[PDB]
Amino acid sequence: MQSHSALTAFQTEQIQDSEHSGKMVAKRQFRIGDIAGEHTSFDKLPEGGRATYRGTAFGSDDAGGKLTYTIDFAAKQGNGKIEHLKSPELNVDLAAADIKPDGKRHAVISGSVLYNQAEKGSYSLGIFGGKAQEVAGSAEVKTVNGIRHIGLAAKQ
């Protein structure tokens, strides 16, 4: 009828200044901080979208893929779909998987992948070079047509 209301709120290691509340820095607080983008943006990735993760994911057979560049600087969801093989089934799409402050910069991203339909693959793409240079990685995509030991090489 005469009826309305609206509320919302959110923050993380992306929202400038709020960030101080977000990550660590200096605050009393309790037990609530970001623990998502802290080191992983800090590497030197700003709030923005698509960074340049250009690489190649050669198969144990080299029936491997290309690592297409798709990471939102916003948090560094370092993922890249593989879509360039003689068999459509071999197309490995990669899920968007984010990167907590693990071992600092967290030189791995625990991203699951699927062979068109078959989600029997785990990737481990990593970061180094601050802006993201040496996105050194591996996968172990495991199927009747899953050439596990993927040689992941990349440069930007």
Name the helicity range: under 10%
How many structural domains are formed by the residues? 1
Shape: globular
CATH topology (fold) name: Porin
Strand order of the largest sheet: 2-1-7-6-5-4-3
From the N-terminal CA to the C-terminal CA, the straight-line distance is 57 Å
Query: Sheet with the most strands?
Result: 7 strands, antiparallel
Percentage of residues in strands? 15-25%
CATH domain class name = Mainly Beta
Assembly classification: monomer
In terms of structural class, how would the helical and strand content be classed?
A: mainly beta
What is the name of the CATH architecture? Beta Barrel
Helical run tally:
2
Radius of gyration: 18 Å
Which H/E pattern describes the elements? Answer: HHEEEEEEE
- Kindly state the number of beta strands: 7
PDB class: signaling protein
Keywords: Neisseria meningitidis, beta-barrel structure, signaling protein
Assembly: monomeric
Entry title: Solution structure of the antigenic domain of GNA1870 of Neisseria meningitidis
What can you tell me about this protein's structure?
The chain has about 160 residues and is mainly beta. It is built from 2 helices and 7 strands; from the N terminus they run H-H-E-E-E-E-E-E-E. The protein has one domain: Porin. Strands 2-1-7-6-5-4-3 form a 7-stranded antiparallel beta sheet, with no helix packed on it.
Question: What topology emerges from the helices and strands here?
Answer:
Layout: H1 18-22, H2 38-42, E1 55-58, E2 65-67, E3 92-94, E4 112-115, E5 118-125, E6 137-141, E7 148-154
